[PDB]
Amino acid sequence: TATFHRCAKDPWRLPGTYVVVLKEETHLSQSERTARRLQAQAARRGYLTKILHVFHGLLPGFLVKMSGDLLELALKLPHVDYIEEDSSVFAQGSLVEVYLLDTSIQSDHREIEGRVMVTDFENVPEEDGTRFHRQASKCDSHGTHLAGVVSGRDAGVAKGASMRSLRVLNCQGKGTVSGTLIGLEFIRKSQLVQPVGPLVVLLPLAGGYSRVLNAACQRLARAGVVLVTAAGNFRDDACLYSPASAPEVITVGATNAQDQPVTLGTLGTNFGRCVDLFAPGEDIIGASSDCSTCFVSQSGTSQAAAHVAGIAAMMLSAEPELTLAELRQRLIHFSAKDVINEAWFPEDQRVLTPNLVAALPPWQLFCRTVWSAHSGPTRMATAIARCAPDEELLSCSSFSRSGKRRGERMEAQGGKLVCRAHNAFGGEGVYAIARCCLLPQANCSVHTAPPAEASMGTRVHCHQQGHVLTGCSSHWEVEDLGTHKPPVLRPRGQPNQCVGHREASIHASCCHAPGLECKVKEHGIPAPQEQVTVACEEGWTLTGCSALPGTSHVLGAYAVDNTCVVRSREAVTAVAICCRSR
C-alpha cells in the first residue's frame, strides 16, 4: 500500500529528487532514522544518496536526491505512506500578516516600503541555460507587482497589511514542489514559535496535480492559516493543478474589465469546480521593479489571487478571530453574481465554474454550492460532495447530462454528512451538488423517510417542534432488475414538505437553530426549453433545490447562488427552500 506518484505532465517532471511521505504519527526521530536507513541501504547497493531536507511540522517525511533505480527499495522502507517525484511550479484596526511565496521583491519601492519584510528564506531551482545570467535584472518583477496588488500605498487593496516574502521562484519564474513544501513548513514553524495573529498565505503559482502539495496545504488550512492560490493560466480544468485543486485553499480565477474570463495569448484563466471565485486579473496596475516609484500593468491568475489575498487581509484586520469557513463564505457572499460571460469556457465546464467576481464587504445564514467530481460510468458509480469541517450539509442534489440518475443521499461518512449522488443503469455518470452552510447555533440532523406506495404516510417533514426543513434528497429505491413502471409523485398537502416519488426514500435535513425561519418557493413552466428557475428574495438564503417531475423530463437541479435551477429536456417545476436567521 506504499504508492509512487509523479506529475501527469511529463515536461514538468524532475526525476532524481523525491519527497518520501511517512505515516501520520511519525516523530522526527523516525523520519531521520528512515532517511538514514535509505542512505545506508543505497550505499550497500553502491549508490550515493543526499538527504536534502527532513520534514517535521507540516508532514512527516524527507527530501532525497537519489537515482530512480532505488525507488523500489525506498517503497519497501518502514513507515512510508507514499513517494512523490519532484516537479516544477510556475509563476502565474488589527495587524494581519500576509506571506508571499514567489520571486524576490524590491522591498524599498515607495508602493510597499515599511510594509514588506524579506524573510531570508530562499529555495529555488537553478536556471535553464548553461550561459544564463540575470545581469542587471534583480529577479524582483513578479513578486513586487503582487506585493503591490496586495498592499501597495496607492494601487493596493489592503493598504494596512504587513507582508513577509519567501523566495520560491527563480529569475525564470520557476520553482519546485519540494521548495514550496519547505516554504510552507517554514510558515507553519514560524506560526508555532510566533503569534496568534491572522495569517494569509498567497501562492501565486501552479504545477501539475501534486498529492503532497495538496496534503501540506490541507494541514496548514486546518492549522488556521488562510491559503489563497492562483487557479492557473492554462485555459484548463484547475483540478489538474496544485495547489489549485486543494479543496481548503481559496482558488481564484481571472476576469477582465468587461467581465470576461482573461485570455493570455492562446491560453487564459483556468476554470471548473476547483475554482472558488474570480477576481480582476487583466491589465492590473502595480509596483514595477524598474524604479522605486514605477508602475506596470500585469495579467494572470496570480494578479487575481493577490486581490483576494488583499480582501481576506482587510476582512481579517476588522474581525481577526474569523475562521477560514467564515472567510470563504463571506468572500462568496459579497462577490458580484452572474456578471461573467460563461461562453468563453468549455460547455461542459460552465455549470461547474462559479459565476462570482470578488468584492469587498460594504447574525447571518451563509450557504455555498459544492459540486463533486463526476462519477464513473459504472452503474453502481457514485459522486461524493463534501463540506468544510465547520459547515452544515443543509441539502443535496444531483445532475447528469443524459439525465439517467437514481437520485441522491445525505449520509454520514466519517462522522460528517456528505452528499452522495448515484449513477443509474445505462447512465454515463453523475455529479453530487451539496449546499454547505454556516448557521449560527445549529443542531441539524437528517431523517430518512421510506418509500410510500400506501395511500397514507406520504408526507415527509420536520415533525419535531422547533426543527425546520432546510433540504430534501430523493433516492430511487427500485432494483435495476425489477419491473420498471413510471414513477408516481407523493401528493401535496402542506407547503413545507419534501416533494418526491412514492417509490423513493426521502432524506430530510431538519435544523434547530435560534432565529431560523425557512420557506418554500415553486415555479413551473409547461414545456420549457433548457431550464426552469425560482430565486429567493433579498435577505433570504437558498438552502435546498429540487426538480419535479423525475428523469422523464429532467436532467437534474442545482443551486446557483440564491437561484434554484432545474435543467429540463426538449410541467417542469423548480422547488426551492429559502432560509434566514434572526
Epitope: 430518512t448 406506495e453 397514507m456 404516510g457 415533525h463 429505491e477 432494483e479
Partner: antibody, heavy 124, light 108 residues
C-alpha cells in the same frame, strides 16, 4: 381476526439459506407494509426490511441488504424473507409485523399486529 | 443511526404504585416513539404510540410522556399480569431502532 401466522422453527448449516414465511389474514394483503425484524437473545430488535405486497417493492436496512431478500405472493397471501450465507450471528428469532398508517405523515403509523416469531438456529 | 438507550431496571415511586423506565435517543425524534410489551414466547404488544397515546384496549394504567430525546414509560398499580419485557422504539428515521428491553420485577 387480523393476524400474521409465521412458519415453524429452523435448523440450517453455516453457509446455507432459509426462507421464512409470514402468512397474513383478516385484512387486505396488498394494502399494508410488512416488516421483518431480528431479535437476538441479549440485544434489542433490529429492523431488517419492509415490503409493500401490492407492488412487491422492498426497502432494506443497509446492514441486511446482502443477507436478506423480501418477496410477496398475493395468491398465497404471504410475505417471505430469504436469508443467505448464514453464520452463527444470524441465529436469532425473526418477527414479521404490519405497519398501520392513520395519517398523511410519514410518522402517522404503528406496528399494530405481529407474528409470534420463528427461531432460526445456524449450526453444524 | 439513532441510538436507543433504555433503563436497566424499573425505578419505583409513590410506594410502588408508579414504576417507570426512561428511553433516550441520540438525536431529536420529536414524538415518534412507541412502547411495546412482550411476554416470553408471545408477539410484541403495542401499548403507547406517538410518545403518549394509548393503542385501543390498552389499560389506562399504562402511560407515556416526553418529547425530543427523553421519553418515560410508566405503569400505575402494576400487577403480576404485567410481568413482561418492555421496549421503546423510534420511528423518526429509518433504519428503525429499538431499546434493549427492561424486565419488570415486582415485590411480594
Amino acid at each position: 381476526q387480523v393476524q400474521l401466522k409465521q412458519s415453524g422453527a429452523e435448523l440450517v448449516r453455516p453457509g446455507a439459506s432459509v426462507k421464512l414465511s409470514c402468512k397474513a389474514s383478516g385484512y387486505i394483503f396488498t394494502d399494508y407494509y410488512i416488516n421483518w425484524l431480528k431479535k437476538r437473545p441479549g440485544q434489542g430488535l433490529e429492523w431488517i426490511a419492509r415490503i409493500y405486497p401490492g407492488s412487491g417493492h422492498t426497502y432494506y436496512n443497509e446492514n441486511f441488504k446482502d443477507k436478506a431478500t423480501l418477496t410477496a405472493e398475493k395468491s398465497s397471501s404471504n410475505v417471505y424473507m430469504q436469508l443467505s450465507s448464514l453464520t452463527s450471528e444470524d441465529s436469532a428469532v425473526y418477527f414479521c409485523a404490519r405497519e398501520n398508517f392513520y395519517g398523511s405523515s410519514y410518522v402517522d403509523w404503528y406496528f399494530d399486529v405481529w407474528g409470534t416469531g420463528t427461531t432460526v438456529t445456524v449450526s453444524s | 443511526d439513532i441510538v436507543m438507550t433504555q433503563s436497566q431496571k424499573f425505578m419505583s415511586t409513590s410506594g410502588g404504585d408508579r414504576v417507570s423506565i426512561t428511553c433516550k435517543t441520540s438525536q431529536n425524534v420529536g414524538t415518534a416513539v412507541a412502547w411495546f410489551q412482550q411476554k416470553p414466547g408471545q408477539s410484541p404488544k403495542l401499548l403507547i404510540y406517538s410518545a403518549s397515546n394509548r393503542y385501543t384496549g390498552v389499560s389506562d394504567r399504562f402511560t407515556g410522556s416526553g418529547s425530543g430525546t427523553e421519553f418515560i414509560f410508566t405503569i400505575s398499580y402494576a400487577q403480576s399480569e404485567d410481568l413482561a419485557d418492555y421496549f421503546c422504539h423510534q420511528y423518526s428515521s429509518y433504519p428503525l431502532t429499538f431499546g434493549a428491553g427492561t424486565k419488570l420485577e415486582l415485590k411480594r
